[PDB]
C-alpha cells in the first residue's frame, strides 16, 4: 500500500481538425486515451506500475495546455469515462455525442486556446485495478478512458474555416496513486 | 452517489404450469428474471439506470402477489442467486433443484395463492455493478437473478391435477439503490 | 385554517370485467375517480367543501374492500396520480399501463377479494387547491385522481375465464383535510 | 423528494449575427431557451425528468463558453425570465429591450469571446413545477426561460462590421434539482 | 424580496343606488375591484408593480370613508373574495347574495355614512402572484377581488326612498407587500 | 426608508473616438452621465424613483464592459464627480483634464478592451437628494455625474491610428439605494 504523488506525466499531443476532416460524429473524437497507471509507455507512472500488482487513482486529473495563439478558436469538451467498454465511436448524432460528453462528471468545456482540467471521478466502492497490459476484460485493468470531443468548427482570426488540421496543445496527467502488493510482473 | 428509493416497479406475470408441462427438473423454473437496475425495459428504475455508470441495490425485494382463487393450489419456492453464472437449468434431480433453491439466503416457500417476498442478499464487500446492457461477463453487470421454482403439482379444488397452465400472479420489485457517477451511456 | 378529520366517505362501487370486455389497454381502467374535496356529490366531505375557499389533503387514503368470495380472482393495481392532466387512457401497451401504474408512489397491487389501501402522496411544496367545481385548469382544483387498473383475467374457481363483468367491491376515502378561508361559494 | 446534482448538461449552440441580420429589436434575441427540467431532449436531466411528477431548480446556472478568437467582438446580455408568459419578442425599441434585459436579476453582460454565467433566481415561495411536456399554461411547467440578447455590432479585428452570422459559442446548464413524487408519466 | 409599506393608495369612488336602479341581485354589486398590486392604474403601488416579477400582499385592507351626511342611510356589506373566478354576478336571490357576502372572512357590514375597513385574508400556503396585466388565468395574477354589496334601500332623513343614485364615498387601500425578483416586464 | 438593491441597470453605449475627432481637451469627454436615481429614462431604477421624495445611493458602481476585440487599444480614465456643478468641459490642457480625472476618488484607468468599475464615493454627511427632474440647482438633485475621459490615441493592431470613431462598449450601474418618503410626484 504505497501512495505515490502528487506528480505529473506527459500523455499526448492533441490535434484540432478542420471542418473537412469531420464527416461523422465519431470524427469529433480528437483523443481517446486509456488511463491505467500502465498505459503511457515511457512515462514515470507507467514505469512504476510494473512493480505492484494493482493500482487505484486517488486523483488523476487531465490537464490540457494550449499551443495555439488567440487568433484561432475551437471549442472542446473533455471528459473521462470510468467504463472502458462504453464507446461513443458509434453514435450517429453530433449533438448526442457532445451531450453524452458534458453529462459525464467532471467534464469540462473550453476554447482550445486556454488551459483547462478534468478530474477522473473516483468510484463509490473501493475498487483497485490490475496493473500492466490488458488481458481478457478492460473493466479489470482500465480505471478510465479520457476523451476530447471537438464541438465546434476550427475557425480563423476572421471567423472563416481553417482549411487544415492543427496540432493545438498537449495533455498532461497530474496524479496521486495507491499501488498495492509488490510484484515484478 | 445518489440514493433512490424506496420505490416499486413491475417485473413480469408468472405462470404456474400443469403436471403435463413439467417433464424435467428444468421445466420447474417458472421465472428467471435478471435483477440489474437496467434489466426491466419500460420501468422507472431501468429508465433511471441509463444516467449513472454503476449501481448497487441496498434493498431489492421481489414481491409475488397472487391472481388466483383459494380453490387452486401450487407450492413455489422463490430465491435470488447473487451469481449470475450459476445456472440450475441443468440439474437432473427434482429434489436437488428445490434444495439448491431453499438453501439460498432469503429464499422463501409458499402456496401460490398468497403474497410473499424475497430479499436480495447484499454482498459482504461493497461491490458496485455496471449499468446498462451486458458486455463480456455477467458478473460485472448482474447483481442477481430471481427464480421461481415450482415444487408441487398444480392442483384443483378437489385435489385433482389441473390440465392447463395458469397465469397465476405477478412480480413486483421494491427497491432502494445507490447509483454512482453521472453518465449518459 | 380548519383541520377536519380523520373521517370516512363512500366513493363508488367497482366492477371487475371479463376478458371479452377488455379489448385495449384503456379498457383496463376500472375506475377513474377525481380526488378533490369537492368531487363526491352527496358525501360529507364534499358537503363541507363548499364553505372554505381552498383545501389540502393531509392524508387521503383510498380503501378498497371486497364484495366477492375467494372462489374468484382478479389482480388490480391501484394508484393516485397527483397530476390531473396526465392521462393513461391513451397508452397502447398493456404492460406499459401497469408499469406506469405501479411506479406511482403509494401504489399498491392486490387480488380483488382482499381489502387494501393506497395513500395520496402529499406535495413537497405546501400547495392548497381551489374547492368547488372545476374552472379553466384542473391543476388548480384536483389534488389528485385515483385509478384502479385491472392487470389480470377475471378467473373462476377452476382457473377458467368468467364470462360476465362482476361488481366486486367498493371504494372508501379515509381523509384528513385542512380547509382555508371561510367562503360560501 | 430526491435531490439530484450538482451536474451539467448541454443546451445549444449560439450564433452571433451580422448587422445586416438585425433589422428589429426582436432580431437581437439570439437564443430563447425554456428551462424546465424537461425541455432539453437527449440530455441527462430531461431523461430523468420523466420519472417524477414535479421539479424545482435549487440552482440552475446557464454557462456560456466561447468558440471564437479575440480578434472578433460582440457584446451580449444574458438573463433568465422566471415568467414564461412575458415575452420581449415584441418591444419596438433597442434600448428598451436591453434595459429590460439587464434589469432581470442575475443578468450578466459580456463580450462574446469570454466565458460567463447567469443564475436562475429562485422564487420567494416554494413553488414546484410540473415535469414533462407543456399542457394548458406555461406557468405550471416552465420555471424559467433563458435569453441571450445581442446589444452591439458583431465587429472584426479592425472595428469593421462582420458581414456574416457566426456560430460563436455554446450553452451549458449546471444544475441542482429537487424532484418530487415518483411517476412514469 | 422587497417589503414595501405600510402605505396607502386611492381605489375608486363608490355610488349607492336608488331602489329603482336595483332590479336584480346582481344590481346590488356597487363595486367589483380586482386587488392585484397591478390593478389600479395611476397609483403608486401599481406603478411599483411593474418592476418585480411577482407580489404577495401581507396586509391589504380596503378602507371605505363616507362622503355623505347623517341624514341619509344605506347599509353595505364589503368583502374580498380570494378566488377571482368565483362570481356572484349570477345569483338569483337577494338574501343569498348578502349571505355569501358576510360569510367571507374579514367581511364587514355598515351604514354608508361611516368609515369601515375590510382586510384581505392571507392564504395558508405562501403563494405569490404574477405582477402585471392578466394572461390566461386570473388565479395566477389576482390575489383577490373586493366587493361592496348594497343590502338595504337608500333612504332619506324621513325614511322615504331616495329617487336618485348618490356617489357616497371613496375606497382606499392600506397595503403591505412583498415583491420578488426584479424584472421590468 | 426603503432599501432597494443590489440591482443593475443599463446606462449608455460608449464611443471611443479617432485622433481626428479630438481637437481640444473637452473632446476627450466620451461620456457625461448624470447619476440621480431619476436620470436614466426607461430603467428600473428611474422607474422606481418617481415614488419616493428623495434618494441616496449607498453603493452606485459604474461598470464598463467592452465590445471590442484585443486588436485595438485605447486608454480611458473613468470617474464620478460628486459635485454636479463642477465642469471640466472647459479646461485648456490635456494633461490637466486627465489629472483632475484620476485624482477623484474611486477613479480607475484602463484599456478599453477590458471590463472595469468605478464606485461613487459616498458623502461624509448623510445627505439625501431630491428625486425626479432637476429644478433650480443640481446640488439638490444630482448625487453625482459619471465621466469617461479618453487619455490615449485609438490605435489598431499595428500601432497605427484608427481613422473612424468606434462604439466600443457599454455602461451599467450596479446600485443600492435608500429611498425616503412615499410620494407620486
Ligand atoms: Ca499483473
Ligand atoms: Ca456503462
Ligand atoms: Ca371557489
Ligand atoms: Ca406529469
Ligand atoms: Ca410578468
Ligand atoms: Ca419631488
PDB file of N, CA and C in Angstrom, chain C residues 1 53-54 126-131 133-137 140-141 180-185, chain E residues 81-83 85-86 96 99-100 103-105 121-125 127 129 136-137 139-140:
ATOM      1  N   UNK C   1     -58.203  28.292   8.641  1.00  0.00           N
ATOM      2  CA  UNK C   1     -57.311  27.075   8.764  1.00  0.00           C
ATOM      3  C   UNK C   1     -57.923  26.051   9.699  1.00  0.00           C
ATOM      4  N   UNK C  53     -62.612  28.407   0.861  1.00  0.00           N
ATOM      5  CA  UNK C  53     -62.161  28.722  -0.496  1.00  0.00           C
ATOM      6  C   UNK C  53     -61.273  27.643  -1.070  1.00  0.00           C
ATOM      7  N   UNK C  54     -60.435  27.076  -0.201  1.00  0.00           N
ATOM      8  CA  UNK C  54     -59.418  26.106  -0.601  1.00  0.00           C
ATOM      9  C   UNK C  54     -59.235  24.978   0.366  1.00  0.00           C
ATOM     10  N   UNK C 126     -46.120  23.346  -0.287  1.00  0.00           N
ATOM     11  CA  UNK C 126     -47.319  23.331   0.511  1.00  0.00           C
ATOM     12  C   UNK C 126     -48.461  23.914  -0.306  1.00  0.00           C
ATOM     13  N   UNK C 127     -48.863  23.221  -1.357  1.00  0.00           N
ATOM     14  CA  UNK C 127     -49.884  23.787  -2.226  1.00  0.00           C
ATOM     15  C   UNK C 127     -51.271  23.478  -1.751  1.00  0.00           C
ATOM     16  N   UNK C 128     -52.094  24.523  -1.676  1.00  0.00           N
ATOM     17  CA  UNK C 128     -53.533  24.378  -1.482  1.00  0.00           C
ATOM     18  C   UNK C 128     -54.238  24.461  -2.829  1.00  0.00           C
ATOM     19  N   UNK C 129     -55.460  23.944  -2.869  1.00  0.00           N
ATOM     20  CA  UNK C 129     -56.220  23.756  -4.096  1.00  0.00           C
ATOM     21  C   UNK C 129     -57.612  24.360  -3.928  1.00  0.00           C
ATOM     22  N   UNK C 130     -58.169  24.850  -5.031  1.00  0.00           N
ATOM     23  CA  UNK C 130     -59.469  25.509  -5.000  1.00  0.00           C
ATOM     24  C   UNK C 130     -60.604  24.491  -4.832  1.00  0.00           C
ATOM     25  N   UNK C 131     -61.492  24.789  -3.892  1.00  0.00           N
ATOM     26  CA  UNK C 131     -62.687  23.997  -3.689  1.00  0.00           C
ATOM     27  C   UNK C 131     -63.687  24.327  -4.750  1.00  0.00           C
ATOM     28  N   UNK C 133     -66.477  23.311  -8.026  1.00  0.00           N
ATOM     29  CA  UNK C 133     -66.418  22.804  -9.375  1.00  0.00           C
ATOM     30  C   UNK C 133     -65.172  23.313 -10.130  1.00  0.00           C
ATOM     31  N   UNK C 134     -64.695  22.513 -11.069  1.00  0.00           N
ATOM     32  CA  UNK C 134     -63.504  22.875 -11.850  1.00  0.00           C
ATOM     33  C   UNK C 134     -63.774  24.059 -12.770  1.00  0.00           C
ATOM     34  N   UNK C 135     -62.829  24.989 -12.880  1.00  0.00           N
ATOM     35  CA  UNK C 135     -62.932  26.133 -13.811  1.00  0.00           C
ATOM     36  C   UNK C 135     -61.998  25.862 -15.003  1.00  0.00           C
ATOM     37  N   UNK C 136     -60.975  26.684 -15.266  1.00  0.00           N
ATOM     38  CA  UNK C 136     -60.193  26.564 -16.511  1.00  0.00           C
ATOM     39  C   UNK C 136     -59.222  25.398 -16.520  1.00  0.00           C
ATOM     40  N   UNK C 137     -58.561  25.155 -15.404  1.00  0.00           N
ATOM     41  CA  UNK C 137     -57.442  24.202 -15.374  1.00  0.00           C
ATOM     42  C   UNK C 137     -57.570  23.284 -14.165  1.00  0.00           C
ATOM     43  N   UNK C 140     -55.371  23.583 -10.755  1.00  0.00           N
ATOM     44  CA  UNK C 140     -55.818  24.432  -9.645  1.00  0.00           C
ATOM     45  C   UNK C 140     -56.855  23.830  -8.684  1.00  0.00           C
ATOM     46  N   UNK C 141     -57.513  22.753  -9.078  1.00  0.00           N
ATOM     47  CA  UNK C 141     -58.634  22.207  -8.320  1.00  0.00           C
ATOM     48  C   UNK C 141     -58.474  20.747  -7.880  1.00  0.00           C
ATOM     49  N   UNK C 180     -58.981  26.228   4.128  1.00  0.00           N
ATOM     50  CA  UNK C 180     -58.607  27.635   4.426  1.00  0.00           C
ATOM     51  C   UNK C 180     -59.614  28.645   3.881  1.00  0.00           C
ATOM     52  N   UNK C 181     -59.910  29.647   4.713  1.00  0.00           N
ATOM     53  CA  UNK C 181     -60.708  30.832   4.375  1.00  0.00           C
ATOM     54  C   UNK C 181     -62.190  30.534   4.194  1.00  0.00           C
ATOM     55  N   UNK C 182     -63.014  30.885   5.187  1.00  0.00           N
ATOM     56  CA  UNK C 182     -64.454  30.701   5.020  1.00  0.00           C
ATOM     57  C   UNK C 182     -65.118  31.601   3.932  1.00  0.00           C
ATOM     58  N   UNK C 183     -65.863  30.922   3.064  1.00  0.00           N
ATOM     59  CA  UNK C 183     -66.491  31.402   1.833  1.00  0.00           C
ATOM     60  C   UNK C 183     -67.841  30.668   1.862  1.00  0.00           C
ATOM     61  N   UNK C 184     -68.791  31.038   1.003  1.00  0.00           N
ATOM     62  CA  UNK C 184     -69.946  30.175   0.698  1.00  0.00           C
ATOM     63  C   UNK C 184     -69.920  29.737  -0.736  1.00  0.00           C
ATOM     64  N   UNK C 185     -69.336  30.500  -1.635  1.00  0.00           N
ATOM     65  CA  UNK C 185     -69.079  29.936  -2.950  1.00  0.00           C
ATOM     66  C   UNK C 185     -70.361  30.029  -3.780  1.00  0.00           C
TER      67      UNK C 185
ATOM     68  N   UNK E  81     -63.147  38.496  -1.935  1.00  0.00           N
ATOM     69  CA  UNK E  81     -63.049  37.115  -2.397  1.00  0.00           C
ATOM     70  C   UNK E  81     -61.603  36.866  -2.782  1.00  0.00           C
ATOM     71  N   UNK E  82     -61.012  35.802  -2.243  1.00  0.00           N
ATOM     72  CA  UNK E  82     -59.643  35.398  -2.599  1.00  0.00           C
ATOM     73  C   UNK E  82     -59.601  34.568  -3.886  1.00  0.00           C
ATOM     74  N   UNK E  83     -60.765  34.162  -4.385  1.00  0.00           N
ATOM     75  CA  UNK E  83     -60.864  33.402  -5.618  1.00  0.00           C
ATOM     76  C   UNK E  83     -61.409  34.304  -6.722  1.00  0.00           C
ATOM     77  N   UNK E  85     -62.173  33.759  -9.716  1.00  0.00           N
ATOM     78  CA  UNK E  85     -63.052  33.105 -10.682  1.00  0.00           C
ATOM     79  C   UNK E  85     -64.396  32.750 -10.105  1.00  0.00           C
ATOM     80  N   UNK E  86     -64.561  32.929  -8.796  1.00  0.00           N
ATOM     81  CA  UNK E  86     -65.883  32.934  -8.197  1.00  0.00           C
ATOM     82  C   UNK E  86     -66.519  34.199  -8.721  1.00  0.00           C
ATOM     83  N   UNK E  96     -79.447  35.426  -0.578  1.00  0.00           N
ATOM     84  CA  UNK E  96     -78.307  34.573  -0.827  1.00  0.00           C
ATOM     85  C   UNK E  96     -77.053  35.372  -1.146  1.00  0.00           C
ATOM     86  N   UNK E  99     -75.700  36.819   2.058  1.00  0.00           N
ATOM     87  CA  UNK E  99     -75.193  35.786   2.954  1.00  0.00           C
ATOM     88  C   UNK E  99     -73.800  35.398   2.526  1.00  0.00           C
ATOM     89  N   UNK E 100     -73.691  35.016   1.257  1.00  0.00           N
ATOM     90  CA  UNK E 100     -72.426  34.648   0.653  1.00  0.00           C
ATOM     91  C   UNK E 100     -71.408  35.734   0.943  1.00  0.00           C
ATOM     92  N   UNK E 103     -70.484  35.866   4.948  1.00  0.00           N
ATOM     93  CA  UNK E 103     -69.740  34.657   5.272  1.00  0.00           C
ATOM     94  C   UNK E 103     -68.290  34.643   4.846  1.00  0.00           C
ATOM     95  N   UNK E 104     -67.851  35.469   3.892  1.00  0.00           N
ATOM     96  CA  UNK E 104     -66.385  35.632   3.679  1.00  0.00           C
ATOM     97  C   UNK E 104     -65.738  36.039   4.955  1.00  0.00           C
ATOM     98  N   UNK E 105     -64.436  35.865   5.037  1.00  0.00           N
ATOM     99  CA  UNK E 105     -63.741  36.206   6.243  1.00  0.00           C
ATOM    100  C   UNK E 105     -63.248  37.639   6.112  1.00  0.00           C
ATOM    101  N   UNK E 121     -57.911  38.369   3.544  1.00  0.00           N
ATOM    102  CA  UNK E 121     -57.376  37.245   4.324  1.00  0.00           C
ATOM    103  C   UNK E 121     -56.228  36.616   3.542  1.00  0.00           C
ATOM    104  N   UNK E 122     -55.076  36.449   4.182  1.00  0.00           N
ATOM    105  CA  UNK E 122     -53.936  35.802   3.510  1.00  0.00           C
ATOM    106  C   UNK E 122     -54.054  34.289   3.443  1.00  0.00           C
ATOM    107  N   UNK E 123     -53.498  33.722   2.376  1.00  0.00           N
ATOM    108  CA  UNK E 123     -53.530  32.278   2.134  1.00  0.00           C
ATOM    109  C   UNK E 123     -52.785  31.480   3.229  1.00  0.00           C
ATOM    110  N   UNK E 124     -53.173  30.221   3.421  1.00  0.00           N
ATOM    111  CA  UNK E 124     -52.492  29.341   4.376  1.00  0.00           C
ATOM    112  C   UNK E 124     -51.135  28.909   3.833  1.00  0.00           C
ATOM    113  N   UNK E 125     -51.092  28.529   2.555  1.00  0.00           N
ATOM    114  CA  UNK E 125     -49.823  28.379   1.828  1.00  0.00           C
ATOM    115  C   UNK E 125     -49.218  29.742   1.582  1.00  0.00           C
ATOM    116  N   UNK E 127     -48.434  31.572  -1.225  1.00  0.00           N
ATOM    117  CA  UNK E 127     -48.464  31.765  -2.667  1.00  0.00           C
ATOM    118  C   UNK E 127     -48.173  33.183  -3.057  1.00  0.00           C
ATOM    119  N   UNK E 129     -47.997  35.813  -6.531  1.00  0.00           N
ATOM    120  CA  UNK E 129     -48.852  36.044  -7.686  1.00  0.00           C
ATOM    121  C   UNK E 129     -48.104  36.895  -8.709  1.00  0.00           C
ATOM    122  N   UNK E 136     -53.572  34.141 -19.090  1.00  0.00           N
ATOM    123  CA  UNK E 136     -54.608  33.124 -19.354  1.00  0.00           C
ATOM    124  C   UNK E 136     -55.597  32.941 -18.218  1.00  0.00           C
ATOM    125  N   UNK E 137     -55.116  32.960 -16.990  1.00  0.00           N
ATOM    126  CA  UNK E 137     -55.945  32.570 -15.840  1.00  0.00           C
ATOM    127  C   UNK E 137     -55.780  33.579 -14.711  1.00  0.00           C
ATOM    128  N   UNK E 139     -56.455  33.318 -11.407  1.00  0.00           N
ATOM    129  CA  UNK E 139     -55.780  32.630 -10.302  1.00  0.00           C
ATOM    130  C   UNK E 139     -54.256  32.676 -10.238  1.00  0.00           C
ATOM    131  N   UNK E 140     -53.577  32.981 -11.342  1.00  0.00           N
ATOM    132  CA  UNK E 140     -52.151  33.322 -11.307  1.00  0.00           C
ATOM    133  C   UNK E 140     -51.796  34.792 -11.036  1.00  0.00           C
TER     134      UNK E 140
END
